[PDB]
Amino acid sequence: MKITAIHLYAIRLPLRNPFVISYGSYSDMPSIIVKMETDEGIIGYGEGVADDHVTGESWESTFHTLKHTLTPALIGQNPMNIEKIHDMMDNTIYGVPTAKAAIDIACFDIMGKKLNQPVYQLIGGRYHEEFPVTHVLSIADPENMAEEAASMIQKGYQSFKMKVGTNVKEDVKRIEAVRERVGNDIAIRVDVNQGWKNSANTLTALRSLGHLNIDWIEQPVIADDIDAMAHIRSKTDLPLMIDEGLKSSREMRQIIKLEAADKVNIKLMKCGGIYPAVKLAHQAEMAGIECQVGSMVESSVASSAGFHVAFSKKIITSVELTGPLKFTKDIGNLHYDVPFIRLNEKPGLGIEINEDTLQELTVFQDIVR
Amino acid sequence: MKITAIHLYAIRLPLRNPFVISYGSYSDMPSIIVKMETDEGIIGYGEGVADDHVTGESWESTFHTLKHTLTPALIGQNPMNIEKIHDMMDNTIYGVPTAKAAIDIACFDIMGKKLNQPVYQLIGGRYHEEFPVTHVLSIADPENMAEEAASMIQKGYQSFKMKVGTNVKEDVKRIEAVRERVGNDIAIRVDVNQGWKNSANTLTALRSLGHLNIDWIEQPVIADDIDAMAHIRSKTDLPLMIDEGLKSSREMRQIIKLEAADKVNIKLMKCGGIYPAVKLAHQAEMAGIECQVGSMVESSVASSAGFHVAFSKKIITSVELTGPLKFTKDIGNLHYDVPFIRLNEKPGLGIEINEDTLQELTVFQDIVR
Amino acid sequence: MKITAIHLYAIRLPLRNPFVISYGSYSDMPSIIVKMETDEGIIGYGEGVADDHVTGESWESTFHTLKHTLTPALIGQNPMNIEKIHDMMDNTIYGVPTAKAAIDIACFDIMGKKLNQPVYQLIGGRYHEEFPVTHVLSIADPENMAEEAASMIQKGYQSFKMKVGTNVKEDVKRIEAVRERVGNDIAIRVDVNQGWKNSANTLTALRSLGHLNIDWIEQPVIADDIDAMAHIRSKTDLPLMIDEGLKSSREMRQIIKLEAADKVNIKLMKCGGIYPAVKLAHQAEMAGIECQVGSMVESSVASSAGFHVAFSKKIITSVELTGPLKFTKDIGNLHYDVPFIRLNEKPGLGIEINEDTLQELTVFQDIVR
Amino acid sequence: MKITAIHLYAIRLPLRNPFVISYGSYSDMPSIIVKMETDEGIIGYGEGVADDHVTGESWESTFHTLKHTLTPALIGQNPMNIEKIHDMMDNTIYGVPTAKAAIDIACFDIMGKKLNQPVYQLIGGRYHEEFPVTHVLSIADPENMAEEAASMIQKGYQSFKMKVGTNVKEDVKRIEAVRERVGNDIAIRVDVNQGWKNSANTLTALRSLGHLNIDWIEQPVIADDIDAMAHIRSKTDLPLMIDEGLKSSREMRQIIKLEAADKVNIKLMKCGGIYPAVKLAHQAEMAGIECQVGSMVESSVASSAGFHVAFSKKIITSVELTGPLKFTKDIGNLHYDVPFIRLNEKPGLGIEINEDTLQELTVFQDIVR
Ligand SMILES: [Mg+2]
Ligand SMILES: [Mg+2]
Ligand SMILES: [Mg+2]
Ligand SMILES: [Mg+2]
């Protein structure tokens, strides 16, 4: 098989409400979509949604490194040889995981369609039947968050994720707020997106959260400080999860060596797609580190890609890909049986792309052959 | 898909000459072959060749743990879900990698045949085109080994592996013997199969081998002593490879933590097959540890299984599966283009089993449904 | 002071001869030039030359992250507050050191012009009077390199840098070749640009280079493996320098902690400019790690920026910015008194930009206000 | 530019009230002032206030090492080359940070005046707009301290620093005293100036201070024991700050290596001035250690010098230079907008020296040319 052409679509996925986190507010979500054509007529879709604050890739920058750097080197290349495809990309350019993920995903889509089989079947088979979905509450006021949780509660939701990290004294204020508001049977996990910066602030915050029964604290310090994470872990009994601090096997190695975390948040956009994500899961498994497959706010394309990885691995015990249900328009149709996700048995990503929706969301595009 | 029956064949592969190593001599090679039947009529072949001295599994013991423990729990199970298949096996019994490998291989064979694709395509695609084959010289006298190398030299062979480990003063005697005999362009690697026992003996031996230009020393100390391996590595500039010291991710973790080796020898029979072997490769990759896929003396069935793993991974840079060309009868037809191995494009293991040869080599058998 | 506009020029600097290294060959050098305008009429020039293989930034990608991400956030911002400028950039996007360097340099140019003083005066004053220039010999055949050195020898050159890393047995072949060719008074340093990959290969190579009197070995293993670097350093007496393995303070911290190197190669394009480079020098100083300011093949703009950092710091003992003398056309006029570099006393970068040359080299451009 | 002469003034700054700490009581504050003259008519002021108990420098000793050792070697030297100036001083004499600070400050004053720009503009630009000022309560009785805080409370003050360290059982007595007295919104930090000596006493004291909500504990053990500091940090969740334990990069390196502190108190008098202080800030930044610029009780001269460093660095988050507002007479006019400090835009230290006040406070003097 040979790649004959690659279409690049710089689109914008509309959000029902502004997504608010520690380092920024989002009114919508820019994304790069790729359509990969092969000499065998089989086509695959991939997606790259860049987060400037995490991987240093932007919407426009990703579009262009795909256009001028990665795609030209991929024409004529075989999408069935995933290891080879990644070797070529890594050799032509270092890093740029989001751009590489977009290509990786399309290759697996093509692979699955070609073998008339869902992606998870190409990376280990199906292991999970379903995963519960947890509702992420954007940074809001103590009662505005306690309330948004009250609503989702009466819709089946069993667990929530509170985004905090503006001010320790305030973030705490919001926690017991929703904890009290939802009883003591609703699971609660908190993500501070580096908001507490260092171990001193973090440890101070944690002493005020021991009675609230939090499942785990996610990335409390700045991404680059894995050392701080290990120091925190040495003085607290609250499970710790690393997110921005983990991108590729490079930091995975450090996390294992320093025993910096109880769990890691793997995101296709941080490591370069399905294949690299599988490698991370295998690495985390060796050290008994539990994994989660999270994501940037992504369309059905990347989201399903993430679920396929999740559904195929026993070490992946939680999932956080809810972009498709935050947008008012999606170019794909990944179906959620809220409060659960179950994958169908369809080939490739098991998704259908609405050409009309894609085209109306496209701000600019190009084709490379 | 569902497993409907599993046939177990306890066979014996005849050897052209006695295979001699540090802890034993072999006149032939006992092996367990498995034929897996599915409700879809698709059949797969797997193989388990036990080495009592390495994994504590024997020919008969493997046959029986397969018959009474593993196979009954696998009937009705789906061979397409490799992760699930291994989860079931691990849950019913700990360890027993050789027995599990036999089942793992048959599942991949079925998977490949089902998707009309070679195994390597299911675990990363094709990465390598070919690998050079190195000739293993069994433990013999200084001139008997120097000679056997002289022969293979004039047949294309570019690299050899000397099996040593009876007596340091003697093993050394054999090395310069063949080194001198073959010039200084022929690659030479030495495997002592734990023969030197500890770091003191090993370090003494190594000082007498610095001028001979050896590619690497393989497993010089007793398997369980990873610490000794790291100590040796701290005081020598000769690359070190761990073989018997590595079986599953359990020791891989220790090897990475202690920086005990430059390279590892992965064998499907030590870790439980293709899937576990792929996980080891990914783990070794995180630490920059080069991998080799070696083997016990195996028929075409396990041997091809090993090659499929090797051919799909950039981190695997050398290969050592030469059983098919040491036997006078093989139940399979894996083709070697000595001094190279190249895999064909056929589905599954890309091999054909000669029922007649299988049956004449079978000493006893059973079927489980 | 306020930034009123920023012009972006995607140019291409023509090379007299192809620049060859371990991971690629260059016929010319793509670069992004920035012209920063202020409400006070003072203008500054900056430059960003991306190396896809090191920081994962490309020519086009850098142009765009500058255009759509960094520059819009900088309009109205004060270029005199360098710490503030960097805070703004880091807050809007993570990494992207080459793009940030382009802006950093223009700000210092403006700062120097504004205070009618050379850049080095704004970062510690002048410390060095001059630095010797060493000639870099691109990867060639053993005698083609021995020869190119013979030539430069009779032009004043006192030290050379051999680019190697294709094959250990070959790279070595080239070393004694030029060493023998130039006597034993000519300094020789070797850069393998990750070519030997790991410590095993590296240590093997090093034993064959002990008699050649090499000043230091530069980045012998893959960038991400700082651990391998420390392991190598524990078993060799040859000074080691880290290049690609060092980008920002993030790896500097690791290098210090693990004692992975004797010296580091700081490049404005890897850390984000003059200010971050000064911080690295201060950090390296705390651990007694000697520094060198090297570079990507850059025009007079970034090259002088690098020299200003070098000339102001006692801890920086060698310099490697020779792009201006490899090009057949330069947009600036940095003057080299081969075999030495001395900086003038002119304000800012102390350079003059030839508008005509800039414009003829520009492939595409834009302006942001 | 060239230094033509250096005037040394041994003065005494009168204190409104006796300053009491763990290891001594002060009725006034001896200080050494330097006036540096250049061939360009530009003059700069510097200051050195020695603390015998911290750096082993005394009022008279500093005056003389300046007179007979440092100044003679500086005549004819260029004050614009700060890196060079420090190299010369370090080469002529080791340590003596207070004496060197006095010279360092005058050089920056001259530099700023020469470039008609404030000092902070020469070391990174302006980053901060203002810093809150915290009121330091000298060692007194439990109610005498609770009271002094009650007063300052009704003057805008938002945070206080309690000097303790005479007796654990007593020091604690004073803490809840003022904590109770000022409510739970007033920030409180405690400095024991080595008073608890070791980790045993310290850890015992800390268990009795967990409920009082202290921002951080400063230097609880003897200066030289960085190990004790790390041990304490391993068993407490209270942020720890090192003061006397930190002087130059020498101990900064140790603090980073052993993870001995959450924050450090940088003082120009302990490291040799503005330039060395900036280097410490950059070093602390690499490890994510927060910095504070504190001081000995200093006049407007050194105090402004300290603020210029503070205002230019994001890593410096708190400030403690309140000498100008403890004296009844100051030779300078640094203006405080209690409870805040904001620096003006004037060149150099942005201060004016009252010759008459200087002269009446001078006990003895000399001039060196
Ligand atoms: Mg997160
Ligand atoms: Mg072996
Ligand atoms: Mg280099
Ligand atoms: Mg203090």
UniProtKB/Swiss-Prot annotation, chains A, B, C, D:
Needed co-factor(s): Mg(2+)
GO biological process: peptide metabolic process
Cofactor notes: Binds 1 Mg(2+) ion per subunit.
Superkingdom, taxonomy of origin: Bacteria
Entry-linked SUPFAM superfamilies: Enolase C-terminal domain-like, Enolase N-terminal domain-like
UniProt-listed CDD domains: L-Ala-DL-Glu_epimerase
InterPro entries attached to this UniProt entry: Dipeptide_epimerase, Enolase-like_C_sf, Enolase-like_N, Enolase_C-like, Mandelate_racemase_C, Mandelate_racemase_N_dom
Family recorded in the similarity comment: Belongs to the mandelate racemase/muconate lactonizing enzyme family.
Described purpose of this protein according to its UniProt entry: Catalyzes efficient racemization of N-succinyl-L-Arg and N-succinyl-L-Lys, suggesting that these are physiological substrates of this enzyme. Has low activity with L-Asp-L-Lys, and even lower activity with L-Leu-L-Arg, L-Leu-L-Lys, N-succinyl-L-His and N-succinyl-L-Met (in vitro).
Name of protein: N-succinyl-L-Arg/Lys racemase
Species annotation: Bacillus cereus (strain ATCC 14579 / DSM 31 / CCUG 7414 / JCM 2152 / NBRC 15305 / NCIMB 9373 / NCTC 2599 / NRRL B-3711)
Organism phylogeny: Bacteria, Bacillati, Bacillota, Bacilli, Bacillales
